[PDB]
Design a protein around this ligand. Structure first.
Ligand SMILES: CC(C)CN(C[C@@H](O)[C@H](Cc1cc(F)cc(F)c1)NC(=O)O[C@H]1[C@H]2CO[C@H]3OC[C@@H]1[C@H]3C2)S(=O)(=O)c1ccc2nc(NC3CC3)sc2c1
Ligand SMILES: [Cl-]
Ligand SMILES: [Cl-]
Ligand code: NA
Lengths: 99, 99
């Protein structure tokens, strides 16, 4: 699709069999989603945005569908205010910015 | 142009007569720039992101040049760790996300 930015670019994602809403975010290096249960081991990561830092759990090689496009990659789980799809997965679904 | 997302989508902006580097950020509703002077009236605002809220100054009807493209809109000025071009100005330069 071609998505304009007059509204938030929200899409549905599917992860862990569940549907969630998430923001397509070119300003985010990584994908960050709210508290949920994921399989496997996790590693620590401390990620910074506006306001300061949060601690998150990093899960690698997680299967996730984004607007119907399959991706497999790193998902950070933590107390984010919104689910964010960052560049690590936007690149897997072939997203570009165009003007 | 077509900007891929392998790296941060950083562009040069001109604002308040200054040159700055800024991130094209589809996950940002508003444009947020590090501390600088701008002419005219302003009012305070609180904006939240991953690590909580920061207080900014809201300046309306500011002209900015973004990667060569002129636009006008509201600019928030405050202690953001990175200059961010948000949807309120990305729409004006005709930016879209495509995949
Ligand atoms: C969290 C989003 C929902 C909003 N944000 C935009 C994101 O694109 C930020 C951009 C950013 C990049 C950085 F480099 C550093 C930063 F401080 C900020 N991304 C990010 O925090 O990413 C993090 C995480 C992702 O992985 C890595 O990448 C970078 C780091 C790191 C860990 S925002 O900035 O908080 C924002 C902007 C304007 C605005 N307008 C408003 N209007 C009111 C509602 C009416 S509210 C509001 C909120
Ligand atoms: Cl505006
Ligand atoms: Cl349009
Ligand atoms: Na003004």
């Amino acid at each position: 699709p071609q998505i304009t930015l007059w509204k938030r670019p929200l899409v549905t994602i599917k992860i862990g069999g569940q549907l969630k809403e998430a923001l397509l975010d070119t300003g985010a290096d990584d994908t960050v989603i709210e508290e949920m249960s994921l399989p496997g081991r996790w590693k620590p990561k401390m990620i910074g945005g506006i306001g300061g830092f949060i601690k998150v759990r990093q899960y690698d090689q997680i299967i996730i569908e984004i607007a119907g496009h399959k991706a497999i990659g790193t998902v950070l789980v933590g107390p984010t205010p919104v689910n964010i799809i960052g560049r690590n997965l936007l690149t897997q679904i072939g997203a570009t910015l165009n003007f």
